[PDB]
Ligand binder design. Structure first.
Ligand SMILES: [Zn+2]
Ligand SMILES: [Zn+2]
Length: 84
């Protein structure tokens, strides 16, 4: 018997960052992750990571660097579960 099911609305927080929940003021710009594709501040989406080893490998993007959110950058860096 193993438990691990979330029973919450199918929607996710909005209007603010999905990491530090820091509203995007006139100064802050709502950025967009490259991996997960979620909204983040200018402090969470400040992580550079390769796309070649993100999900789809191609002879085009090899030495490229994309911006991702900490939450992801951390998951991508270390290995473990099936990227999804
Ligand atoms: Zn943030
Ligand atoms: Zn992300």
């Amino acid at each position: 018997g193993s438990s691990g099911s979330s029973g919450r609305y199918p929607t996710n927080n909005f209007g603010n960052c999905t990491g530090c929940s820091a509203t995007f003021s006139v100064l802050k710009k709502r950025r967009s992750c490259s991996n997960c594709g979620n909204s983040f501040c200018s402090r969470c989406c400040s992580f550079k990571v390769p796309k070649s080893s993100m999900g789809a490998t191609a002879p085009e993007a090899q030495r490229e660097t994309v911006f991702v959110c900490a939450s992801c950058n951390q998951t991508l860096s270390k290995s473990g579960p099936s990227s999804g």
